[PDB]
From a paper:
The terminal uridylyltransferase 4 (TUT4) and/or its homolog TUT7 mono-uridylylate group II pre-let-7, and promote subsequent Dicer processing, since pre-let-7 with a 2-nt 3′-overhang is a good Dicer substrate. Lin28 binding to pre-let-7 competes with the Dicer processing of pre-let-7, recruits TUT4/7 to the Lin28:pre-let-7 complex, and promotes the oligo-uridylylation of pre-let-7 by TUT4/7. The NTD1 in the N-terminal half is inactive since it lacks the catalytic carboxylates for the nucleotidyltransferase activity, while the NTD2 in the C-terminal half is responsible for the nucleotidyltransfer reaction.
To obtain the crystal of the LIM, the N-terminal region (residues 1–252) and an internal putative flexible region (residues 579–610) were truncated from the N-terminal half of hTUT4 (residues 1–723), yielding hTUT4_N. The crystal belongs to the space group I212121 and contains two hTUT4_N molecules in the asymmetric unit. The structure was refined to an R factor of 21.1% (Rfree of 23.8%), using reflections up to 2.4 Å resolution. The hTUT4_N protein consists of three domains: zinc finger (ZF: residues 253–343), non-catalytic palm (nc-palm; residues 368–489), and fingers (residues 344–367 and 490–723). The ZF consists of five α-helices (α1–α5) and three β-strands (β1–β3), which compose a large structural domain distinct from other zinc fingers or zinc knuckles, such as the one in the C-terminus of hTUT723. A comparison of the structure of the hTUT4 NTD1 with that of the catalytic domain of hTUT7 revealed that two of the three catalytic carboxylates in hTUT7 are substituted with non-catalytic residues in the NDT1 of hTUT4. As a result, the pocket is totally closed, and the 3′-end of the RNA primer and an incoming nucleotide cannot access the region. The evolutional conservation analysis and electrostatic surface analysis of the overall structure of hTUT4_N revealed that one side of hTUT4_N is highly conserved and positively charged. Altogether, the N-terminal ZF of hTUT4 interacts with the dsRNA region of pre-let-7 and contributes to the stable ternary complex formation with Lin28 and pre-let-7, thus leading to the efficient Lin28-dependent oligo-uridylylation of pre-let-7.
Residue numbers in the entry: 254 to 578, 611 to 711, 720 to 731
The structure:
Amino acid sequence: EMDYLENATVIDESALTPEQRLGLKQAEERLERDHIFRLEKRSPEYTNCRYLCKLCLIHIENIQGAHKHIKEKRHKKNILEKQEESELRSLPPPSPAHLAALSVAVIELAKEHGITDDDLRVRQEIVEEMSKVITTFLPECSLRLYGSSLTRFALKSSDVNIDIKFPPKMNHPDLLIKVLGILKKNVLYVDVESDFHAKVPVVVCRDRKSGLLCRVSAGNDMACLTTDLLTALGKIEPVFIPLVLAFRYWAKLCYIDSQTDGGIPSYCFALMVMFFLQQRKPPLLPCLLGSWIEGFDPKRMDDFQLKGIVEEKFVKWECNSSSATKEKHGKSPLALETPNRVSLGQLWLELLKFYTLDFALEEYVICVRIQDILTRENKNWPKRRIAIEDPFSVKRNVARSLNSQLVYEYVVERFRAAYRYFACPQVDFKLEHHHHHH
Ligand SMILES: [Zn+2]
Ligand SMILES: [Zn+2]
């Protein structure tokens, strides 16, 4: 009875009738047409295990169970995903006209909606007037601009990030409370409000002259270092800013942003663009650390600490611990030797393809300090989901905030959807999101 033998979870192979051996081998051959095989055993004694589905990597216990599994959710979903991937991978190369359309659309997103040199002028003037206001109550401190205002990695409307440098014999919570009172009393601003629970504690106000929201922090040195590195890179390589803007807004990654962000998601996506630019062949951005450092070993790269910008062309590095390097400090060039001629459309498609099809996001670390590809284990970091090394805090995976189930699945979905959408003429995408871009 094939009826028993299809449901039996353990088969006495010797007790099988030659005709039953025949029928079972035929059934199994049929099951193979759906990726289901007898698992070869290690020490067989008619033992435990029967069938492996290579698609789902699922152990199945009998023939009837294999036929139920073929038609169930997991197997159907995997069949689909495999089909979608084959489609994505067999896409014909884009036409010159489609590439040009994409190129013009990307640069026009940056030009019509991005932060302009005159917009930076406005925001720097905001900082100058506010520093006038703050210092004439509190003269030791200084003000400076950071974040997107300088990097241009957000749109015309985005918030103005302003950091207060203060002396150590001055207490940070007290400092922000005093600043809150000062800005409340001063008529240059409206809607002055503390935001002290946010990831970075800040005072919020609206500059009445420019209508721009300002977020005033204190002692946020790391964010300023980060801003200066990314600003210098964007000034040296013209494709950096429009690719970051497209990646963030066209792919709809902005849907992740909230005002309690701390800007971490957008920072992650900027780092991902920079990583792609470093990892391209040929590359369009240099790596921050490498063989020009005499004695540099990619292992124990975590003994290095990146510092400020010099001449707007170099980033300082220190290695204060014992090591094989000749020098304790140095500087790395932020500029290639003319990674000359590739259109924005081609870069946009390549970037989408890199993250949709080509880079094993779950297995590696997005690391913008070295060119060598880091496995999770190289960092002794856990596997799964997204991993981005903060180049200025190297034990920190900044993408941990992307790694909720919702956001992770969204990011993967947006890569696939965007690539699918932009790879073929439908595309001069016109943004029209119905939400503020901060
Ligand atoms: Zn399956
Ligand atoms: Zn948006």
